[PDB]
Write a protein that binds this ligand. Structure first.
Ligand SMILES: Nc1nc2c(ncn2[C@@H]2O[C@H](CO)[C@@H](OP(=O)(O)O)[C@H]2O)c(=O)[nH]1
Ligand SMILES: [Ca+2]
Length: 104
């Protein structure tokens, strides 16, 4: 069973942990990857009810199981905060334009 389901993409807790650790490490060194510069601030315009405090940073999680390193980021993202605490897993799938919805 999926721990997080973003549309057709199925992710386990280890998939999320691996992605988060990669993005947080980059955040710490103050470095970015990709043309859209990941990771970067997630403003939470959607107003999701997160259990942890802001600021939030988004980092893409890939269905291939690879750690993001550039190019198309896909539709899924892991959102973590300053203390490397998982805020949630979100996706562009099933959401209008460039909005997000939470993965079930
Ligand atoms: N939809 C959305 N985008 C945000 C938010 N905060 C920052 N952004 C950035 O603006 C862009 C609008 O889609 C997003 O790019 P993304 O597709 O790479 O996630 C995202 O990086 C937010 O709260 N909601
Ligand atoms: Ca997996």
């Amino acid at each position: 069973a999926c721990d997080y389901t973003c549309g057709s993409n199925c992710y386990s807790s280890s998939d999320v942990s691996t992605a988060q650790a990669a993005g947080y490490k980059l955040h710490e060194d103050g470095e970015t990857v990709g043309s859209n510069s990941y990771p970067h601030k997630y403003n939470n315009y959607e107003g999701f009810d997160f259990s942890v405090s802001s600021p939030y940073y988004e980092w893409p999680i890939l269905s291939s199981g690879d750690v993001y390193s550039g190019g198309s980021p896909g539709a899924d993202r892991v959102v973590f905060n300053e203390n490397n605490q998982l805020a949630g897993v979100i996706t562009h799938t099933g959401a209008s334009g460039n909005n997000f919805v939470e993965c079930t």
